[PDB]
Each structure stands twice: as structure tokens, then as C-alpha cells.
Coordinates of C-alpha atoms and ligand atoms in Angstrom, one line a residue:
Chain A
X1 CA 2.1 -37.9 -9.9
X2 CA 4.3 -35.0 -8.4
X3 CA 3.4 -32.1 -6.6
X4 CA 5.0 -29.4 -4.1
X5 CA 4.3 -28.6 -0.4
X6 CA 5.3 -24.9 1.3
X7 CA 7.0 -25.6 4.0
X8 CA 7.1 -24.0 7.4
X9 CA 10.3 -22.4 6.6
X10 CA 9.5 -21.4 3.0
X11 CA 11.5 -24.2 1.6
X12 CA 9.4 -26.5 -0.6
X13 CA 9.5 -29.8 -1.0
X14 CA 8.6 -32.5 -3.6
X15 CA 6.0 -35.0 -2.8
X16 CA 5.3 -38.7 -4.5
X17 CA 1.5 -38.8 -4.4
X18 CA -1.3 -40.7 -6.7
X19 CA -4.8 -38.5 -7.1
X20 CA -6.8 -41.2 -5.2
X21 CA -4.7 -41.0 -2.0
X22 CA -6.1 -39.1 0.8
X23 CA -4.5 -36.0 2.5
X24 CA -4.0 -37.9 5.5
X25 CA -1.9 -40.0 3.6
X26 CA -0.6 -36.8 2.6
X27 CA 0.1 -35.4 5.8
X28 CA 1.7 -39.0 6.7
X29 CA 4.1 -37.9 3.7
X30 CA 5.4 -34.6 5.0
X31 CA 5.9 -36.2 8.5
X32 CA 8.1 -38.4 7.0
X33 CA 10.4 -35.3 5.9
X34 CA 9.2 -32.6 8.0
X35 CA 8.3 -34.4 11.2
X36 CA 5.1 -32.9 11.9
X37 CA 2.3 -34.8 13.4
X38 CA -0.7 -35.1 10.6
X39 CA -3.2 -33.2 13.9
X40 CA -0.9 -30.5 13.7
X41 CA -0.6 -29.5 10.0
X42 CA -2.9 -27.7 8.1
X43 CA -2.4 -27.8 4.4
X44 CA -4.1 -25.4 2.2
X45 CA -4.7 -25.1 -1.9
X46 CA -6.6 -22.5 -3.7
X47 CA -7.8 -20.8 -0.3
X48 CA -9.3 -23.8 0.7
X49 CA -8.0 -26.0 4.1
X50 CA -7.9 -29.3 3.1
X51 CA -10.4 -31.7 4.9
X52 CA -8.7 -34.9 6.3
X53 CA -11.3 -37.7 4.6
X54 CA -11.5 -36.3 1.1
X55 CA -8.7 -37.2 -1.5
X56 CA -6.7 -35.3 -3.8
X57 CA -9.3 -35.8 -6.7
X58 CA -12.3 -34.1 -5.1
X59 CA -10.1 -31.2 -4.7
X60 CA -8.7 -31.6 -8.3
X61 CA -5.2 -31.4 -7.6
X62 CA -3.3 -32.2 -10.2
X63 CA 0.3 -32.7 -10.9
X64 CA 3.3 -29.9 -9.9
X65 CA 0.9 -28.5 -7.4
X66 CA 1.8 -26.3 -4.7
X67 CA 0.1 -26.9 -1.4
X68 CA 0.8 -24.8 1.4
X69 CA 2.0 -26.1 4.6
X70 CA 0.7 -24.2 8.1
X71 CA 0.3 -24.7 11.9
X72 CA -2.5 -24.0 14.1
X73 CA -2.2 -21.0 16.6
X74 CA -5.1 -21.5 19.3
X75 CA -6.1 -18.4 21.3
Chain E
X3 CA -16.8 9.4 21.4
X4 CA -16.0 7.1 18.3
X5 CA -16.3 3.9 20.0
X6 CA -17.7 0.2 18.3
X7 CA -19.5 -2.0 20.2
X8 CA -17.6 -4.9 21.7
X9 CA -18.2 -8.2 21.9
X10 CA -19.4 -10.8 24.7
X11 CA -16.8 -13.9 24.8
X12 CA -18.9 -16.9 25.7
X13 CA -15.6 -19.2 26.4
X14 CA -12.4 -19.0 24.8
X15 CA -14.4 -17.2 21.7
X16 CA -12.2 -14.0 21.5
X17 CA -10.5 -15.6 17.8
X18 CA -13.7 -15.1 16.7
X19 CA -14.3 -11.8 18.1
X20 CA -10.8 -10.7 17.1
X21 CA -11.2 -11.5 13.4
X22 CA -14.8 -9.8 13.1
X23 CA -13.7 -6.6 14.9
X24 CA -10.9 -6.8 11.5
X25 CA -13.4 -7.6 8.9
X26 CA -15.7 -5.2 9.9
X27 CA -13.0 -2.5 9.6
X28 CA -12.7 -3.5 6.1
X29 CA -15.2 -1.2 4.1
X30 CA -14.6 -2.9 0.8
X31 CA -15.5 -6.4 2.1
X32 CA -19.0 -4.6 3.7
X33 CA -19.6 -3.5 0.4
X34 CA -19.4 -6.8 -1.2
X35 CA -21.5 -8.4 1.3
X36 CA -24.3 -6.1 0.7
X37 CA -24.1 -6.4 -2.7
X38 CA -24.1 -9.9 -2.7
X39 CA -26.9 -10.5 -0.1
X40 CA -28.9 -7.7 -2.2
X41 CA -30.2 -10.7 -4.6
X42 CA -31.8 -12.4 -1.9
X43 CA -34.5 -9.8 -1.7
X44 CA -35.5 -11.2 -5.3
X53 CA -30.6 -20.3 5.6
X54 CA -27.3 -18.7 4.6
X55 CA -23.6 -17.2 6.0
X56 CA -23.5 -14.5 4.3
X57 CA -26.8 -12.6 6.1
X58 CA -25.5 -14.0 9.5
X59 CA -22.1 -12.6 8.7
X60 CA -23.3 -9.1 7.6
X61 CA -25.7 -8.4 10.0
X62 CA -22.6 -8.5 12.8
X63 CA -20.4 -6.6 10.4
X64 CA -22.7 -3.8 9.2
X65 CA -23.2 -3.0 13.4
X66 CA -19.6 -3.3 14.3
X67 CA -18.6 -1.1 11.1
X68 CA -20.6 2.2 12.9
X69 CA -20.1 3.7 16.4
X70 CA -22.1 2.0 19.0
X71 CA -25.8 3.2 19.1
X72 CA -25.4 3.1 23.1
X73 CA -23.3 3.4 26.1
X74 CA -20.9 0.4 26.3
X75 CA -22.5 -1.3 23.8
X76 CA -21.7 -5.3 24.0
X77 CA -23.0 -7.8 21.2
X78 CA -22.7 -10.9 20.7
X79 CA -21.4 -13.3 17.6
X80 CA -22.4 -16.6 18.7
X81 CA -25.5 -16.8 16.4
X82 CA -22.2 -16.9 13.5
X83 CA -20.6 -19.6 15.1
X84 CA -23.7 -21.7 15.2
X85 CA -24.3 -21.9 11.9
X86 CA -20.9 -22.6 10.8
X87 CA -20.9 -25.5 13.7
X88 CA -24.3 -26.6 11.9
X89 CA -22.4 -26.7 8.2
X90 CA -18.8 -25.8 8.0
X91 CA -17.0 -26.2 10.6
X92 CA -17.2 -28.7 13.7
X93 CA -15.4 -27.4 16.8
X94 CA -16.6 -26.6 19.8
X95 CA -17.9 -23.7 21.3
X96 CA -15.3 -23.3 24.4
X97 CA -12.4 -24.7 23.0
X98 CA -9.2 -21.8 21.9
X99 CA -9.2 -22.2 17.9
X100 CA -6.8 -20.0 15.2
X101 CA -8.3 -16.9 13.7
X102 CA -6.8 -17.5 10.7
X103 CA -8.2 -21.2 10.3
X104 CA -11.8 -19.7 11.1
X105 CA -11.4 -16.8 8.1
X106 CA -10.8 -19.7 5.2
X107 CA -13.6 -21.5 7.0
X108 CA -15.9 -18.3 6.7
X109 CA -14.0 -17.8 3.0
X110 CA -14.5 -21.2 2.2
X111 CA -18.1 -21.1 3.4
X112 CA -18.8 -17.2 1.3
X113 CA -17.3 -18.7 -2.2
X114 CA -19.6 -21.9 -1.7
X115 CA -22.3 -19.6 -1.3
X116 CA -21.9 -17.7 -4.5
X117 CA -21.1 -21.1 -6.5
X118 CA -24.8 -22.0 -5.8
X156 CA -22.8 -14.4 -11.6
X157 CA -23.2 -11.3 -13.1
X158 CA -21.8 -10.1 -9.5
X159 CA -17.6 -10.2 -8.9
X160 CA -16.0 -13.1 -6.4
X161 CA -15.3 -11.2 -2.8
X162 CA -12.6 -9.0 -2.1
X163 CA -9.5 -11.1 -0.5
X164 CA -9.5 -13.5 -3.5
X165 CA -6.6 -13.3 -5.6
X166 CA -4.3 -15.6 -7.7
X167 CA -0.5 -15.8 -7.5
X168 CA 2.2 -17.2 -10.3
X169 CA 4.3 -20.1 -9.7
X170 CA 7.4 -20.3 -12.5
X171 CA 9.8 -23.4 -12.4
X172 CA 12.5 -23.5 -15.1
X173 CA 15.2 -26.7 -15.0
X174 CA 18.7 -25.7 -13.9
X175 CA 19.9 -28.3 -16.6
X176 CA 18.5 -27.7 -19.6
X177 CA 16.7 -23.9 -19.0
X178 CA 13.7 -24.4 -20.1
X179 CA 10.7 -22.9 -18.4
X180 CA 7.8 -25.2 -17.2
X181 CA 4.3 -23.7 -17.8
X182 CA 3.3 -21.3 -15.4
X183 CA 0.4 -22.3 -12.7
X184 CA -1.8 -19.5 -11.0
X185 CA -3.2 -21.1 -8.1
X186 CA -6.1 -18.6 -6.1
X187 CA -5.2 -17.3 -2.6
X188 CA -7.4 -16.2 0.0
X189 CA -4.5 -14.7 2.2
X190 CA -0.4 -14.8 2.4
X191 CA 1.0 -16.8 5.2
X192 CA 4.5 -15.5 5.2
X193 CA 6.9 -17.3 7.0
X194 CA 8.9 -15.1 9.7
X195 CA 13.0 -15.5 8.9
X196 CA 15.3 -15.7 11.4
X199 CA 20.6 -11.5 14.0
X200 CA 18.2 -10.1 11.8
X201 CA 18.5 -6.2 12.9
X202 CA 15.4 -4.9 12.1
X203 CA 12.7 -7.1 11.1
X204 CA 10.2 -6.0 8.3
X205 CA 6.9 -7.0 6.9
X206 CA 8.7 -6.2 3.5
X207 CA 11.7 -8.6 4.1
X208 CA 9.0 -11.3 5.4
X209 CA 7.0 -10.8 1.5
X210 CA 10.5 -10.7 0.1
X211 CA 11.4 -14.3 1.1
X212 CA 8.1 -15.5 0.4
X213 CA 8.3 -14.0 -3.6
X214 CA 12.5 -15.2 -3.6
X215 CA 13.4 -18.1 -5.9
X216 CA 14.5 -21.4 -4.3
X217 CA 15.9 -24.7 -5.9
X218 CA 14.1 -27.7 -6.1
X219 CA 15.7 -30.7 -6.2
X220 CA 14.7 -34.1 -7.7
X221 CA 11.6 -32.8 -10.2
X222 CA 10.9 -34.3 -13.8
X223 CA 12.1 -32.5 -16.5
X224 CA 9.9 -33.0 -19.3
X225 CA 12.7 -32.2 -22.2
X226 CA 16.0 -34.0 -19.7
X227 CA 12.7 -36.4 -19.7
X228 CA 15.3 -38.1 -16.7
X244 CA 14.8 -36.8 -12.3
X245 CA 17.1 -33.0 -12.0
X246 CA 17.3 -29.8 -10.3
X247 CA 15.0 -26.8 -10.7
X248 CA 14.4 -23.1 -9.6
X249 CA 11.4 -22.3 -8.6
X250 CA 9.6 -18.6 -7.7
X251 CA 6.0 -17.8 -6.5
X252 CA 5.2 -14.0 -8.0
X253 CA 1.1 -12.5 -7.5
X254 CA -0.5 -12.2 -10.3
X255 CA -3.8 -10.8 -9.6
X256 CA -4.3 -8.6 -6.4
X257 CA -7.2 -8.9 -4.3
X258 CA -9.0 -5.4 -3.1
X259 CA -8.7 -6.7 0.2
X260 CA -5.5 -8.3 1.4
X261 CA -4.9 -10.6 4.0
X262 CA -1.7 -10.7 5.5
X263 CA -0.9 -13.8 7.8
X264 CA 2.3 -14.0 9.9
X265 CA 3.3 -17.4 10.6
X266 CA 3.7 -17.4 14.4
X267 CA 4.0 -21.2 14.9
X268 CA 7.6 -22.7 13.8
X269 CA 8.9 -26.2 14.2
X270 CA 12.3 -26.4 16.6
X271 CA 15.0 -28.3 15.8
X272 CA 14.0 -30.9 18.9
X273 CA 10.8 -31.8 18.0
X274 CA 8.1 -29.3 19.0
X275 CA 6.4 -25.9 18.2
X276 CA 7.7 -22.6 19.1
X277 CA 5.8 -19.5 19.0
X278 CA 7.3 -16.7 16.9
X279 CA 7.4 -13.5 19.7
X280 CA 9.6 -11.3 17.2
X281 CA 8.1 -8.0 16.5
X282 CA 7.9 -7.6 12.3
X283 CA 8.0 -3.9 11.6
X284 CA 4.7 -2.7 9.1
X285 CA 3.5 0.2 7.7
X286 CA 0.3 2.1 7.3
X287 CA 0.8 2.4 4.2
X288 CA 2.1 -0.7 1.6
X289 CA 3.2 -0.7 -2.1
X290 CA 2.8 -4.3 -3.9
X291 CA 4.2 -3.4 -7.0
X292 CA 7.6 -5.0 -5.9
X293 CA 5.6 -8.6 -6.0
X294 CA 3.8 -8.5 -9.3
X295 CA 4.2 -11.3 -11.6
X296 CA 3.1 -9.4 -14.6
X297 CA 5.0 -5.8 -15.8
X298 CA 2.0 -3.6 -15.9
X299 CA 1.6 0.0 -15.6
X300 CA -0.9 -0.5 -12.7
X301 CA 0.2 0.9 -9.2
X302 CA -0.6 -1.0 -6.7
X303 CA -1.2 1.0 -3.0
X304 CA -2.6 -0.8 0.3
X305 CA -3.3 1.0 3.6
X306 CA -3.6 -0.7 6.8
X307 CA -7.7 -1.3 8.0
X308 CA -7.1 -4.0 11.2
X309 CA -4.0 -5.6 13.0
X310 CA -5.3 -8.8 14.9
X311 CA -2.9 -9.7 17.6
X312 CA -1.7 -13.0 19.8
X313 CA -0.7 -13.1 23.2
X314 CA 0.6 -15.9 24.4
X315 CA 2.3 -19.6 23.9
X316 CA 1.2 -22.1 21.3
X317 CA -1.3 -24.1 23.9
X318 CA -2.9 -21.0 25.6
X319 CA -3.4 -17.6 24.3
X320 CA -5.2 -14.5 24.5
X321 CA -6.5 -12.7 20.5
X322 CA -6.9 -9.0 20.5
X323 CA -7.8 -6.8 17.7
X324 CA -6.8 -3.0 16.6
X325 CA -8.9 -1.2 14.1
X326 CA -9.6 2.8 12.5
X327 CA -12.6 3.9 14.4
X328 CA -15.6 4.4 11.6
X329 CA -16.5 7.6 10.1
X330 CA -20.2 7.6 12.3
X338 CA -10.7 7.9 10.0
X339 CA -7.3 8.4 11.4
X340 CA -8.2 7.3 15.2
X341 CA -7.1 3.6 15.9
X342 CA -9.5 1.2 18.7
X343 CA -7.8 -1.4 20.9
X344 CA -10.1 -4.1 21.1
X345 CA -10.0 -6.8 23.3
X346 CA -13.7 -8.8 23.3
X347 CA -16.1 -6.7 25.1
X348 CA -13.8 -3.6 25.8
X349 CA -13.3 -1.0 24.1
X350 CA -10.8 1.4 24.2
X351 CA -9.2 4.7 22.2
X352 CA -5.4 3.3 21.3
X353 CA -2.4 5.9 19.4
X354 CA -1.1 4.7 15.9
X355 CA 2.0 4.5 17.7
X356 CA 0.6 1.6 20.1
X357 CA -0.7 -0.1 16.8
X358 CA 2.6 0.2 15.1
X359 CA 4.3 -1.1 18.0
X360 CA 2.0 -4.3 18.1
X361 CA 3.1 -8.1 17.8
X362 CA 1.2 -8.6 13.9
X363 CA -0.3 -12.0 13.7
X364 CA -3.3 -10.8 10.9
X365 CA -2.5 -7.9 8.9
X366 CA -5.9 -6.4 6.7
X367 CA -5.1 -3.9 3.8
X368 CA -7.0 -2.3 1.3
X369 CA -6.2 -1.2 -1.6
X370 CA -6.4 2.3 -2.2
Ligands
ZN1 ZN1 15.8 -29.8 -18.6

């Protein structure tokens, strides 16, 4: 299917991605545009952070979705 | 003197102790607690969670009071989130962890979903043809707004601006072109939540290669009208006022998370609150602060 990432900036992208791939696949995607290393993203849909291990189905993402792309801040 | 009780950090712990002192300035979200941990009186987060909130929402019941919060992050260690308990972690990752944790909780309903939910509009309409996608109303738990770029004056308004501005998507399938082509998409908010979460994306990606914290100071208000932002054109005003402000000092690696909040009625006096001290601070100090977590209420 096809589904949307929000960027760092704002900008968002378009993804290639098949529900039974993982969202460390995932995040091995927007590295591949945005450059950032899978540790350091943190993608959340629906108010949920997505959990690296888990695939796209148990969240039930489905196609033109809109996942939202963040980084971690520790203090 | 209208002080709350601080809280003990036990080893880098103060982005836990930084988001409580917010929630529990949040009356609306205390409210909802105890009306949804009122059916157990027919273990869980929600009792661990309110019993912290309900004694940092009053004035302290002695001198220098000084709790502590680590009994929360046990149990979120046990079931929802593993981290340490030393280790310098992001307040806004642990409030969808206690979010997450809250509408699990409820899933297992007479009783209404908590306060920060709400659900936003995304509308995409090809630039070839003009015709308009469905719309697709995704929930949100908070609004992580990235921070623009001379920009004179910087404002939480121009920030929620750019996040609710149209953009054009390349390379999408249009159902009717049937194709790939160009579209124009737009994120509006459809429903707002009672309580809104405001997060200020610190944490940008430099042109070399690595992150760069985001020092700029974003102008806010006490007071903030959403009506600007709705999806939807009805008559419903829509007016927030400011409850908490949580704060980061410091780089990406280390950093320091402090907290200002309204003192509790047993109003208009503002607490800086930095782990275990507590101290009176002016709304001007407040207004003047580096915003990482912005908490409204509607009004
Ligand atoms: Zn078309």
C-alpha cells in the first residue's frame, strides 16, 4: 500500500509499505529519505508510539495513513 | 503560603517529575481520573497515577513537603514501558506511554474517553484532476508542532499555523487519474480535546548529519483561541487557558526538565518547580520561559 509520514520539518513524505512489514522496516524506510537512524525516531499514529517488533497490521494501519515522525529529547 | 509538595529525583527522574507537577495542574484531567477509578469501588495505572496527582493538585499538608513518584514508574517498568530507572528519558514519550497505558485501561463505557484525546482531519485533493480524496480523522493525544525557522518574533500561533498549512504531495495515486500525480494535502482538528497538549519539537535534524536542539524562545499566551484550526464551521467557540509549561534545559544528550504551574486554590499565582523545590515564580517568568510542553484547558 501507500501511506504518509510527518516529517521533522512538517513536510510529508510518501512511503511504499505492505501491512505485514514491521516498523523497523518502517523506520529503515524514512532513513533512506530522511537520514535518521531507526534508535532515534519515534513514529506515532492515533496517540500511540509505535513499538519496534509489532507490524503495521496489529496497529491496523491502513493505506494513505499519516504517521507522525518525532525525536527523543532526554532530560 | 500556596506551595505543592515537590518531588524526590531518585536519578535522572526529574522528566517524570516535570510532567506530573503539569498533569496535576490540570483540574479537568483529576476529574476524569476520579471518575474513572470510581467503578473500582464496585493492579492498575490509573489508582497509582491519581493517588500522586490528587496530593500534588493541593497545597502541601506540611513544611517542605517532598514525595516521591517512583512507585508510578515501577509499574509502568513492570507493564508498559521498559527503561531504566537512572537513565534521562523524554517527557513527552513517557505522557503517550502513561496515555497509551490509561486508554488500555478503559478498553478492558457508559463513562467518556479522558480529556487530551481528540481527533484531527486530513484532506488530500489531486492537483490534476481536483477531486477530493475521502477525508481521514486520525485520534491525537497531543500536537507536536514543528518549530520554523530571521523569523522576528516567534509565536506559538505561527508554530499551529504551519502545522494546519496545506503542503503538496508529490507522487500519490489518484484514484480517478488512476496513473502516480501531485496532490495538496492539509491536516485541520476536528474534535477538540478538554485538555490540550501542546508539544514543541525541540530536536531538529542539521543539514550534516546530527541533532540540534531548538533554543529559540516561541512566544505563548495565557490565554488561546482554536477556532482558527477547526476543520468543521461550527458555531462552537473554542477558548484554552494555560494550566502548566514544562521546560528543557540543556543539549540533546544531557538535560535538566523543570515545570511551571498555577498554584491550587487550597488561581492567578504561578510555581517554579524544579523536582523537590519549590518556589513562588511571576507570570512574567513563566511567559518568558523556553516552552517544550504546553497544557491548556479549555474554558
Ligand atoms: Zn486526479
Amino acid at each position: 500500500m501507500q501511506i504518509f509520514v510527518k516529517t521533522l520539518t512538517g513536510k510529508t513524505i510518501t512511503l511504499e509499505v505492505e501491512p505485514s512489514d514491521t516498523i523497523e522496516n518502517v523506520k529503515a524506510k524514512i532513513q533512506d529519505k530522511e537520514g535518521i537512524p531507526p534508535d532515534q525516531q519515534r513514529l506515532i499514529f492515533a496517540g500511540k508510539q509505535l513499538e519496534d517488533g509489532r507490524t503495521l497490521s496489529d496497529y491496523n494501519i491502513q493505506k494513505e495513513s499519516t504517521l507522525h515522525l518525532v525525536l527523543r529529547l532526554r532530560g | 503560603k500556596g506551595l505543592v509538595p515537590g518531588l524526590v529525583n531518585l536519578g535522572n527522574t526529574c522528566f517524570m517529575n516535570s510532567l506530573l507537577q503539569g498533569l496535576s495542574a490540570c483540574p479537568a484531567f483529576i476529574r476524569w481520573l476520579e471518575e474513572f477509578t470510581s467503578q473500582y469501588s464496585r493492579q492498575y495505572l490509573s489508582l497509582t497515577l491519581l493517588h500522586l496527582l490528587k496530593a500534588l493538585s493541593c497545597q502541601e499538608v506540611t513544611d517542605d513537603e517532598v514525595l516521591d513518584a517512583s512507585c508510578l514508574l515501577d509499574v509502568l517498568r513492570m507493564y508498559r514501558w521498559q527503561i531504566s530507572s537512572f537513565e534521562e528519558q523524554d517527557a513527552h514519550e513517557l505522557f503517550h506511554v502513561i496515555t497509551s497505558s490509561l486508554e488500555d485501561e478503559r478498553d478492558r463505557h457508559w463513562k467518556s474517553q479522558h480529556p487530551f484525546h481528540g481527533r484531527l482531519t486530513s484532506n488530500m485533493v489531486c492537483k490534476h484532476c481536483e477531486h477530493q480524496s475521502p477525508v481521514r480523522f486520525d485520534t491525537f493525544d497531543s500536537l507536536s508542532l514543528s518549530i520554523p525557522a530571521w523569523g522576528h518574533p516567534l509565536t506559538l500561533d505561527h508554530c499551529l499555523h504551519h502545522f494546519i498549512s496545506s503542503e503538496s504531495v508529490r507522487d500519490v495515486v489518484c484514484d480517478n487519474c488512476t496513473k502516480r500525480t501531485t496532490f495538496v494535502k492539509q491536516l485541520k482538528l476536528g474534535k477538540l480535546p478538554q485538555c490540550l497538549c501542546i508539544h514543541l519539537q525541540r530536536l531538529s535534524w542539521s543539514s550534516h548529519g546530527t541533532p540540534l536542539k531548538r533554543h529559540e524562545h516561541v512566544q505563548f499566551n495565557e490565554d488561546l483561541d482554536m477556532d482558527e484550526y477547526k476543520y468543521h464551521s461550527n458555531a462552537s467557540t473554542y477558548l484554552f487557558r494555560l494550566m502548566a509549561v514544562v521546560v528543557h534545559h540543556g543539549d540533546m544528550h544531557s538535560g535538566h526538565f523543570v515545570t511551571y504551574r498555577r498554584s491550587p486554590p487550597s488561581s492567578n499565582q504561578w510555581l517554579w518547580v524544579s523536582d523537590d523545590t519549590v518556589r513562588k515564580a511571576s507570570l512574567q517568568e513563566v511567559l518568558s520561559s523556553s516552552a517544550y510542553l504546553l497544557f491548556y484547558e479549555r474554558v
